[PDB]
């Protein structure tokens, strides 16, 4: 099949390039650029600031272009600059000169990745229902491409720590290739503003601010929580990329069967089920005592992704007009998720101190479970009462 294999490999090489930068990002600043953690909380604040003017902006374009590939050409164009970004630009600029004047080099990561990954999901999602395949399939490539690169980072961490970027950049032109050969064949912005007074959006986004925002702030400093339950902070880290690498292969597997499960259960129960798996991880982490316990908890993250990603599209397409699938994705499951993740993280630090780590996860989990249970009623569609 023409589109499936091209855009399936597109995810493979796209997330390979996100898998070098992202899943080990704080370490890069910590060790390899010697940046204090009283300064990395300001870098993320600017990588998430250019993400807020791009994410909605990418949503309207990703619809107005429809199946036109221009917006995805820009991304594949900017991703070629990946190697000389980290190695020669971003790297020396943040340290030697002021962090503020280099925190605007997090514009790059705002465009390509934080606001560009979901634009790739959304676009390939539209193509996913003009060809004959399921979005969960092909998207499953992202996890294994993420896993492949994930291993190589650790495998290459002491050998040549610039290599992952150089290889990453080489895949960007491979990404240009697959974008070209693949062959694939409305609204106005004032109709777009109609959705914001439709009360069916308010309850979808409520679910995101409630369940998904709480979950992604929970997975913020999970690295600090995870390490304590290994004998050495360092040795626990050395087992961390093992879990991440391995569990992502499982994650693709879970996603493999995801769309079949998703297609009948329906969209709403897909999110409710995702919300339950999310809440279970957030609450049950309060009852963590041993390494095996915390390891298995982290693997719930691999049960969670398929249902959230695949499910949200099934929801957005099923209950909303498709003339807005990219927009209400990049505004609800990305923008509104990111906008609320500014504040829910702020008082997650005033809960690390105010009531400890496991006591912080308890407040979050009962807000996560809180809004999961609430969205059986606020979300329109068929609830779990049907089966």
Ligand X SMILES: O=[N+]([O-])c1ccc(O[C@H]2O[C@H](CO)[C@H](O)[C@H](O)[C@H]2O)cc1
Scan residues 73-112 and list those touching ligand BNG (CB under 6 A): 87-88, 92
Residue nearest to ligand BNG (CB): 162
Which residue number, 117 or 339, has a Cβ lying nearer to ligand X? 117
In our burial notation (b when 16+ CB lie closer than 10 A, e otherwise), range 124-145 reads bbbbbeebebbbbbbbbbbbbb
Q: Which does 305 bind (CB under 5 to 8 A by kind): ligand BNG, ligand X, none?
A: ligand X
For residue 94, give Cα distances in angstroms to 79, 90, 132.
Answer: 20, 6, 46
Q: Which of the listed partners (ligand X, ligand BNG, none) does 88 bind, with a CB threshold of 5 to 8 Å by partner kind?
A: ligand BNG
Tokens 């962090």, residue? Answer: 99
Among 56, 106, 118, 381, binds ligand X (CB under 6 A): 118
Q: Which of 54, 146, 329, 335 binds ligand X (CB under 6 A)?
A: 146
Angle 62-67-72 (CA atoms, 0-180°, nearest 5)?
Answer: 55
> How many alpha carbons fall within 13 Å on the CB side of residue 276?
10
CB of 155 to ligand BNG, least distance (A): 16
Choose the contact partner of 87 out of ligand BNG, ligand X, none; CB within 5 to 8 A by kind: ligand BNG
CB atoms within 10 A of CB 219: 15
Residues in 11-40 at the binding interface with ligand X, rule: CB under 6 A: 15, 18, 22
Torsion of CA 256, 125, 75, 205, to 10 degrees: -100
Q: Is the Cβ of residue 169 or residue 317 nearer to ligand BNG in the bound state?
A: 169
The single residue among 56, 142, 259, 275 that binds ligand X, judged by CB under 6 A, is 142
The residue from 43, 75, 143, 360 that contacts ligand X (CB under 6 A) is 143
DSSP secondary-structure letter at 97? S
Say which entry of ligand X, ligand BNG, none residue 117 contacts (CB below 5 to 8 A, set by partner kind). Answer: ligand X
DSSP state of 81: G
Nearer to ligand BNG, 12 or 165 (CB): 165
User: Do 66 and 356 form a contact (C-beta atoms < 8 A)?
Assistant: no
Among 150, 158, 25, residue whose Cα is nearest residue 94? 25
| Distance separating alpha carbons of residues 140 and 143, to the nearest angstrom | 6
Can you read off the two tokens belonging to residue 68?
């036109």
Residue 91 is a binding residue for ligand X (CB under 6 A): no
Residue count, binding to ligand X (CB under 6 A) = 13
**Could you say which residues in the range 211-230 bind ligand BNG, by CB under 6 A?**
none
Return the SS3 of 387.
coil
Residue from 48, 114, 205, 285 binding ligand X (CB under 6 A): 114
Distance CA 345, CA 339 (A): 11
Interhelix angle for 2-21 vs 163-181, to 10°? Answer: 160
The token duo for 169 is 């950049």
If contact means CB under 5 to 8 A according to the sort of partner, which of ligand X, ligand BNG, none does residue 233 touch? none
Residue 107 interacting partner from ligand X, ligand BNG, none (CB closer than 5 to 8 Å by kind): none
Q: Is 162 in the site for ligand BNG (CB under 6 A)?
A: yes
Q: Given candidates 16, 58, 248, 278, which one binds ligand X under the rule CB under 6 A? A: 248
Question: What Rg do the C-alpha atoms of the chain give, in angstroms?
Answer: 20
Nearest-angstrom CA–CA distance, 52 and 46: 10
- Compare residues 312 and 360 and give the one whose CB is closer to ligand X: 312
| Per CB under 6 A, 251 contacts ligand X | yes
Q: Per rule CB under 6 A, is residue 33 in the interface with ligand BNG?
A: no
Q: Which residues sit at the interface with ligand BNG, rule CB under 6 A? A: 87-88, 92, 160, 162
- Residue ranges binding ligand X (CB under 6 A): 15, 18, 22, 113-114, 117-118, 142-143, 146, 248, 251, 305
């Amino acid at each position: 099949n023409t589109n499936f294999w091209m855009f399936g490999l597109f995810f493979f090489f796209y997330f390979f390039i996100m898998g070098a930068y992202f899943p080990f990002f704080p370490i890069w600043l910590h060790d390899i650029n010697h940046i204090s953690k009283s300064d990395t909380w300001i870098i993320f604040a600017a990588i998430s600031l250019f993400s807020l003017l791009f994410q909605p902006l990418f949503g309207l374009l990703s619809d107005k272009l429809g199946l036109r590939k221009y917006l995805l050409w820009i991304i594949t164009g900017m991703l070629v600059m990946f190697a000389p970004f980290f190695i020669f630009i971003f790297g020396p600029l943040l340290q030697y000169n002021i962090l503020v004047g280099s925190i605007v080099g997090g514009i790059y990561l705002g465009f390509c990745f934080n606001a560009g990954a979901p634009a790739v999901e959304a676009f390939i999602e539209k193509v996913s229902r003009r060809s004959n395949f399921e979005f969960g399939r092909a998207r499953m490539f992202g996890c294994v491409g993420w896993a492949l690169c994930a291993s190589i980072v650790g495998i290459m961490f002491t050998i040549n720590n610039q290599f992952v970027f150089w290889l990453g950049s080489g895949c960007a032109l491979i990404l240009a290739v697959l974008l070209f050969f693949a062959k694939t064949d409305a609204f106005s912005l004032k109709l777009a503003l109609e959705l914001f007074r439709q009360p069916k959006l308010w309850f979808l986004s409520l679910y995101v601010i409630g369940v998904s925002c709480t979950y992604d702030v929970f997975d913020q400093q999970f690295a600090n929580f995870f390490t304590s339950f290994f004998a050495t902070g360092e040795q626990g880290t050395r087992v961390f990329w093992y879990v991440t690498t391995m569990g992502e292969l499982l994650n693709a597997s879970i996603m493999f069967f995801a769309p079949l499960i998703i297609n009948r259960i329906g969209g709403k129960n897909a999110l409710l089920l995702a919300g339950t798996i999310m809440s279970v991880r957030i609450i049950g982490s309060s009852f963590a005592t041993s390494a095996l316990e915390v390891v298995i908890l982290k693997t719930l993250h691999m049960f969670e992704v398929p249902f959230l990603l695949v499910g949200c599209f099934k929801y957005i397409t099923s209950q909303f007009e498709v003339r807005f699938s990219a927009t209400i994705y990049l505004v609800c499951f990305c923008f509104f998720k990111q906008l609320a993740m500014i504040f829910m993280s702020v008082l997650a630090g005033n809960m690390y101190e105010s009531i400890g780590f496991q006591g912080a996860y308890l407040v979050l989990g009962l807000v996560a479970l809180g809004f999961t249970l609430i969205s059986v009623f606020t979300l329109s569609g068929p609830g779990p009462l049907s089966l």
